[PDB]
Design an enzyme around this catalytic site. Structure first.
Site, PDB file in Angstrom:
ATOM      1  N   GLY A  16      63.292   8.029 -28.623  1.00 28.08           N
ATOM      2  CA  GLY A  16      64.085   8.842 -27.720  1.00 28.08           C
ATOM      3  C   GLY A  16      65.147   8.044 -26.989  1.00 28.08           C
ATOM      4  O   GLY A  16      65.097   6.814 -26.947  1.00 28.08           O
ATOM      5  N   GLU A  17      67.519   4.348 -25.102  1.00 29.87           N
ATOM      6  CA  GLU A  17      67.242   4.214 -26.527  1.00 29.87           C
ATOM      7  C   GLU A  17      66.062   3.276 -26.763  1.00 29.87           C
ATOM      8  O   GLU A  17      66.240   2.068 -26.919  1.00 29.87           O
ATOM      9  CB  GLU A  17      68.476   3.699 -27.274  1.00 29.87           C
ATOM     10  N   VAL A  18      64.858   3.836 -26.787  1.00 28.58           N
ATOM     11  CA  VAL A  18      63.651   3.038 -26.969  1.00 28.58           C
ATOM     12  C   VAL A  18      63.031   3.276 -28.344  1.00 28.58           C
ATOM     13  O   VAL A  18      62.801   4.417 -28.745  1.00 28.58           O
ATOM     14  CB  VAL A  18      62.617   3.336 -25.863  1.00 28.58           C
ATOM     15  N   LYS A  32      63.110  -0.992 -25.255  1.00 28.31           N
ATOM     16  CA  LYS A  32      64.151  -0.246 -24.558  1.00 28.31           C
ATOM     17  C   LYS A  32      65.474  -0.998 -24.615  1.00 28.31           C
ATOM     18  O   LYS A  32      65.602  -2.086 -24.056  1.00 28.31           O
ATOM     19  CB  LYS A  32      63.768   0.015 -23.101  1.00 28.31           C
ATOM     20  N   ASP A 109      62.201   6.692  -8.405  1.00 23.71           N
ATOM     21  CA  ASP A 109      62.325   7.713  -9.439  1.00 23.71           C
ATOM     22  C   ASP A 109      60.963   8.069 -10.016  1.00 23.71           C
ATOM     23  O   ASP A 109      60.733   7.951 -11.219  1.00 23.71           O
ATOM     24  CB  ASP A 109      63.267   7.248 -10.552  1.00 23.71           C
TER      25      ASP A 109
HETATM   26  C1  LIG Z   1      53.382  12.244 -29.142  1.00 26.96           C
HETATM   27  C2  LIG Z   1      54.102  11.422 -29.645  1.00 26.96           C
HETATM   28  C3  LIG Z   1      55.001  10.351 -30.253  1.00 26.96           C
HETATM   29  N1  LIG Z   1      55.441   9.453 -29.226  1.00 26.96           N
HETATM   30  C4  LIG Z   1      56.784   9.449 -28.731  1.00 26.96           C
HETATM   31  O1  LIG Z   1      57.594  10.248 -29.167  1.00 26.96           O
HETATM   32  C5  LIG Z   1      57.192   8.464 -27.628  1.00 26.96           C
HETATM   33  C6  LIG Z   1      56.421   7.225 -27.376  1.00 26.96           C
HETATM   34  C7  LIG Z   1      56.834   6.295 -26.293  1.00 26.96           C
HETATM   35  N2  LIG Z   1      56.072   5.079 -26.070  1.00 26.96           N
HETATM   36  C8  LIG Z   1      56.490   4.020 -25.172  1.00 26.96           C
HETATM   37  C9  LIG Z   1      57.787   3.654 -24.890  1.00 26.96           C
HETATM   38  C10 LIG Z   1      57.759   2.623 -23.994  1.00 26.96           C
HETATM   39  C11 LIG Z   1      58.994   1.917 -23.425  1.00 26.96           C
HETATM   40  C12 LIG Z   1      59.155   2.038 -21.920  1.00 26.96           C
HETATM   41  C13 LIG Z   1      60.058   2.833 -22.845  1.00 26.96           C
HETATM   42  N3  LIG Z   1      56.462   2.340 -23.722  1.00 26.96           N
HETATM   43  N4  LIG Z   1      55.677   3.201 -24.453  1.00 26.96           N
HETATM   44  N5  LIG Z   1      57.980   6.613 -25.495  1.00 26.96           N
HETATM   45  C14 LIG Z   1      58.736   7.849 -25.740  1.00 26.96           C
HETATM   46  N6  LIG Z   1      59.900   8.175 -24.945  1.00 26.96           N
HETATM   47  C15 LIG Z   1      60.804   9.212 -25.397  1.00 26.96           C
HETATM   48  C16 LIG Z   1      61.775   9.745 -24.362  1.00 26.96           C
HETATM   49  N7  LIG Z   1      62.324   8.786 -23.474  1.00 26.96           N
HETATM   50  C17 LIG Z   1      63.740   8.791 -23.095  1.00 26.96           C
HETATM   51  O2  LIG Z   1      64.474   9.641 -23.572  1.00 26.96           O
HETATM   52  C18 LIG Z   1      64.335   7.730 -22.119  1.00 26.96           C
HETATM   53  C19 LIG Z   1      63.997   7.703 -20.631  1.00 26.96           C
HETATM   54  C20 LIG Z   1      64.607   6.647 -19.705  1.00 26.96           C
HETATM   55  C21 LIG Z   1      65.565   5.597 -20.258  1.00 26.96           C
HETATM   56  O3  LIG Z   1      66.131   4.633 -19.382  1.00 26.96           O
HETATM   57  S1  LIG Z   1      66.410   3.212 -19.844  1.00 26.96           S
HETATM   58  O4  LIG Z   1      67.027   2.437 -18.710  1.00 26.96           O
HETATM   59  O5  LIG Z   1      67.510   3.133 -20.887  1.00 26.96           O
HETATM   60  C22 LIG Z   1      65.922   5.621 -21.737  1.00 26.96           C
HETATM   61  C23 LIG Z   1      65.306   6.680 -22.650  1.00 26.96           C
HETATM   62  C24 LIG Z   1      61.415   7.833 -22.957  1.00 26.96           C
HETATM   63  C25 LIG Z   1      60.410   7.252 -23.947  1.00 26.96           C
HETATM   64  N8  LIG Z   1      58.321   8.759 -26.816  1.00 26.96           N
END
Ligand SMILES: C#CCNC(=O)c1cc(Nc2cc(C3CC3)[nH]n2)nc(N2CCN(C(=O)c3ccc(O[S+](=O)=O)cc3)CC2)n1
Ligand SMILES: C#CCNC(=O)c1cc(Nc2cc(C3CC3)[nH]n2)nc(N2CCN(C(=O)c3ccc(O[S+](=O)=O)cc3)CC2)n1
Lengths: 242, 238
Positions: A16, A17-18, A32, A109
């Site tokens: 989701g 850019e992680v 991330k 936040d």
């Molecule tokens: C069920 C099922 C399958 N799992 C996932 O689909 C799944 C697994 C995951 N596991 C993780 C990631 C991490 C890392 C600390 C991130 N630890 N464990 N994370 C996410 N998501 C997606 C949506 N998200 C966002 O859209 C966003 C928000 C702020 C952000 O700020 S940052 O400063 O750039 C930039 C992106 C955030 C994470 N999605």
């Protein structure tokens, strides 16, 4: 650079850019793409594994399988979530925030979007990009005057409790940001969610106080929710949604 | 019954006949010349029935919607400036009407833009009570359920996001029947968020039971730009 620094090639699917990658061929990580996520170290905070300081700046953390808490509540799994699991997840969040509290830090936040779920309903606080020492989620003294404290995080926790007890529904339904700012200053608080205990809603209003220093600490919040179904609501019984 | 009114008070012919007229000289209505279900169903997102003339010539008096159908409204001159925020909003209002239909254990059997009316302030209501719109299990076997209305809602999301273009372009009912049954789904329409397209594919599941409810659909569209697409930005069309 420091000891947290790693080569950019040491670390090898989008989320989701992680991204979900792999560190040393045996470690499942999340990348991330302050010095605040480094100092903070708690089981209820998403652990930082490594950091890249060269462009583009990477952030290597532990991997949470169930993703965001907001997606998890809105998702197919979230409809079977009853109050016992919900209060338990709130307690886990309040546990990490209590750590943040005694560490004298501020999250700025706190919301379901920035909380990740793992295996066995393990919830951890994430994203300390604004951390230091979302208007519907932000305390009014912070959304207007910039007064961010740990007691402004308690307000957000109060808002967070509505997301859990409504399975990720946006706070103040039908209202816009400037409409929330006006109503909150006038004293308007979100009513007790359907099928939600008033003892839990009282805890919300306590987190939603005009006076920041009158809002209860996270140490209290943690203890109140952990001992909830014995000390506060031992007469609890299951319903349609909660 | 008690829905009867004296033959008073038709003015212009909207579009079996549909007229805009006045009732009792005060209230503006929509006269349809020329059922028993519109008397039971009451919801702010369903076109409300006002009165009935039971003997020939039969006449049906419902509330008036000024913008006509949702289909003409999209293809029309007003739909030109419709961005996604207003489009997801209209889809949420419709899902609300169908959520009421859902919790009332009813089936619409024809959920499409042609059967949805628009009024002032972009208010959309379901009306009336098409193989491209109806579910395959309903088209072939006759299995019409609320989850078959969810399929049509999935098709409905395409019309909104494409300003009312006919689904499966360049394909006939014989092509659609075979392709959809072969697993073919409509691709993500131009400038449409993939999250919204994922919701479409959910409504287009082969197994009707796995398709999401209208209670869910309503909530997903209402909290869309906060929970699902927070970083949305305007484009040329969407
Ligand atoms: C069920 C099922 C399958 N799992 C996932 O689909 C799944 C697994 C995951 N596991 C993780 C990631 C991490 C890392 C600390 C991130 N630890 N464990 N994370 C996410 N998501 C997606 C949506 N998200 C966002 O859209 C966003 C928000 C702020 C952000 O700020 S940052 O400063 O750039 C930039 C992106 C955030 C994470 N999605
Ligand atoms: C912009 C602009 C001007 N507005 C219109 O030009 C305008 C306004 C309107 N407002 C309304 C109607 C109603 C009542 C449910 C009718 N409420 N509010 N309706 C229509 N219509 C829709 C439908 N049209 C039909 O012709 C039909 C429908 C069912 C039907 O089945 S029924 O069992 O016979 C057999 C024909 C033809 C244009 N057109």
């Amino acid at each position: 650079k420091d000891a947290w620094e790693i080569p950019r090639e040491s670390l090898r699917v989008k989320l989701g850019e992680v991204w979900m990658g792999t560190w040393n061929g045996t470690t499942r990580v999340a990348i991330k793409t302050a010095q605040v996520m480094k100092k903070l170290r708690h089981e209820k905070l998403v652990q930082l594994y490594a950091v890249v300081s060269e462009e583009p700046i990477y952030i290597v953390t532990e991997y949470m399988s169930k993703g965001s808490l907001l997606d998890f509540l809105k998702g197919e799994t979230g409809k079977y979530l009853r109050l016992p699991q919900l209060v338990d997840m709130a307690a886990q969040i309040a546990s990490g925030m209590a750590y943040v509290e005694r560490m004298n830090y501020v999250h700025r936040d706190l919301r379901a979007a920035n909380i990740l779920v793992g295996e066995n309903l393990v919830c951890k606080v994430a994203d300390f990009g604004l951390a230091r020492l979302p208007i519907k989620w932000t305390a009014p003294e912070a959304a207007l005057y910039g007064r961010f404290t740990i007691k402004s995080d308690v307000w957000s926790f109060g808002i967070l409790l509505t997301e859990l007890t409504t399975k990720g529904r946006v706070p103040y339904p039908g209202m816009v940001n400037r409409e929330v700012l006006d109503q909150v200053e006038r004293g308007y608080r979100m009513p007790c969610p359907p099928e939600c205990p008033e003892s839990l809603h009282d805890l919300m209003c306590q987190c939603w106080r005009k006076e920041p220093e009158e809002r209860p600490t996270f140490e209290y919040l943690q203890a109140f929710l952990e001992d909830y179904f014995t000390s506060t609501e031992p007469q609890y019984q299951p319903g349609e949604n909660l």
